[model samples]
Target: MFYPDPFDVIIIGGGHAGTEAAMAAARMGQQTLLLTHNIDTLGQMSCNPAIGGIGKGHLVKEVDALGGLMAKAIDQAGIQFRILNASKGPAVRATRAQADRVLYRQAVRTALENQPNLMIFQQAVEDLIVENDRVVGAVTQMGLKFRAKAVVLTVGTFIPLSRRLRELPLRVGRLKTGTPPRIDARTIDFSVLAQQHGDNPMPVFSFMGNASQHPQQVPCYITHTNDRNQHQIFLEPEGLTSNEIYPNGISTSLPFDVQMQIVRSMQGMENAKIVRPGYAIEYDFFDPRDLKPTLESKFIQGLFFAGQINGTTGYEEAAAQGLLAGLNAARLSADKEGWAPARSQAYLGVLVDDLCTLGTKEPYRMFTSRAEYRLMLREDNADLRLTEIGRELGLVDDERWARFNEKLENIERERQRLKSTWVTPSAEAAAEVNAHLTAPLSREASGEDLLRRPEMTYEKLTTLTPFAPALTDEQAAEQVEIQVKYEGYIA
Candidate 1:
């Protein structure tokens, strides 16, 4: 019944959390095994076909900085890209992308398949083989046992608890959520709905990604449910080649016929037909308080948990938890101390701290408001904040590390240049400044000082005498402007 060889880390699912866990462990040079019921379902966006938003995008960026795969996968699969809160402050601004579900799945599978030191097996875990008070491995459905130094239980929304785990008297609960039925894009009257397009200058999700990696771009459409109803309809293209559209925000547990009536009531969905029925299913989750900040069981020596099983929602949240758990699991196998970032370090920190410290009665969702140091944890500077840590942990590759350091050097050099360069209040410069300012410059001001003006920006300041050419890299330029203008506020 025992496997031929033991693994350093064994992960018990193939969703966002599980995939990240497996990849992270393998990246750390561990002999890792990812067991799942179906290999085809790996990285399947079971609910929505998008990634990142407001607080959520912050997590994805941090994951990307730490060498996780979600951001890169989305970058390859995304069809529509937009920067949310484009006009808002940099601290609150975030990137959101709509993905082709099929492409997304393929991207994830390809990454997993190519990852070194990681093995994939098709089988459902039936039980945990706990020796004494610590987890030594897991048993599959066919009674094949897998021995590992550490085990991460990311069994998101599945049933049939492990006999040894169930015997431990663990706390379990259920919550319900649903998705609207998909409709044929050809049948839906898109002309009646407003057309929404991606941003003019498309934003890349990962530091390693570029516009060239994306597939053919497309636009999304918008529609609404009845005015009195609390639901809204987001008509998203399911994939590049498919005719299906995901009608988001209509999650319901109502009967099938009633679901049809609701869909028909929408403005552009009058004749929409359901590709799948919308129904609700309850899944078991363990109380996160039972675990530590490292996502390891406080009572058990080598058991860990992540994803919805920890009472959280969203793919980003799950992936973040999975990365943390997987990283710690690999460390545990090496007899090294587990690591968890501080709340000020990354959104992933705030998420794990909130979960283990305060336990959730309802499903926990992340928000920008949750982190006290959100200003320093902005999405724009995710790599600046965490890439070093990732590099030290063996997660960040040489290319990413080099790019990160180059960006840091660029930001610093530009920032110093702005502080030293000064603009004199003179005839020609004054005339040009008057056009953008309420009044002509009365005294000499540093380029940094000029950028702090409400009317001035990095681009605008470049037009003046001392600050002639702006930084070419948009991301670098953004960091310089934010650091210079908001220095006082952030401090």
Candidate 2:
């Protein structure tokens, strides 16, 4: 017997997608219930704790513009942020953040608790409680029945009762990616692997996030495979063997004996202690194409899917899908018009179309190269691109809408300045210009043209121009320079 009365919307799972789906529906004023197997693991970073990169970052910003929680959550939990593809044009520039796993999960949970019309329940769904070809609710593993007008199955990576790697198909053509086991911090020999740090001191994921409000951040290190490590794996393979293991290919989980032997043969891992042995879980996923772009299942009315259950590989992707599914579900219950972004319009749309159109043979991951009009769908401009639609749908709030407008005003002001300002061949200007580019200017040139030089940059020009006394260096100013410089290509 269920304790709560019937809900308007029910969301399954607690991962990135599930969390967003639950929150979106709740914020729409629906009586929403988010059902998960484990509440503590909500928004858990099962793999790497990084968010946003190239094409993926664009999606995060779009999600934010649409009133999704991913960007805000990252800002609260991100440990480091960096702008990647910085040398490329503005259209290609992307932001990436390394998040603190524990803080990230906690932040997401807090957001859910604060949302009105939303409820959280900890239980496994044993079966779908359907009526007359439409889903009315679900039966939890405990035998309690909770009814809802619409059920969104954001059951990421938990379907069809199986977990084998060989049976599935992934997008990269071959499924080869796997997580590395974490070594006890005390046990690891740091001397062997090289340390890699972020180029910038502090990285920011959300454009709207107050840089100071983020938690204290740190740098991450990187390690590469050495010759000794290769010899060790070749000679003493342990936990690498199992009935589930395949020949010739890499073994993710063998036996402990084999693992110790292999570790002892390595240069730095001689004293390595395994914190968590990595294991590949091949689970069932619904071909996302089976659902409409709105995430409502095509075969079953009121049934929806989101997150990894739809075959996506990243936390951001899952969360973005969840937001769309939840918002659409709420609309369904209200008998209002449902929504779906276009591939050319937003990264979220591109991702959804890829899922519903291409589907995947294995787990799917996002990359900048996948987008055809990536130049127009930049992370920096996501709010400008999607905020209007979000506000219309009741997802974006007054504060977010105002913040987005403020950013637009700044961007436009910067653009006008770049277009109107011109520099003459003064000795100081010539020396500065020639220092970074091929030759000194022959005559006066627009600040936009100067930015187009291979080595010249917005930072350098700002140092030279120092516009009106009130104008200081703004990141958006640099973006304006880059945008103006690349107008030909973008057009």
How well does model 2 score by local distance difference test? 0.69
Candidate number of the best TM-score: 1
Report model 2's TM-score to 2 decimal places: 0.81
lDDT of 2 by residue, 1-491 (tens): 86569888998886788888887998787889888899878877766667887567777888887888888898888766778877765667778877677778889889988888998989887776668668888877788889988888765334322232123342222133354444454565556655444545465666567688677665544333333454222111111111111111224565655755544444455676766665555655567777787878777788777876776777778878888998998998887867899867877877887788877422223433554365677777676678888888778878878876776677787767766777667635556555556675767777677777767766666666323332353556645665666665756
Indicate the residue-level lDDT of 434 in model 2.
57
Evaluated at residue 66, the lDDT of candidate 1 is: 95
After superposition, candidate 1 runs with Cα above 4 Å error: 156-161, 225-232, 361-372, 427-431
TM-score of each: 0.94, 0.81
Per-residue lDDT of 29 in model 2? 75
Clashes of each: 0, 13
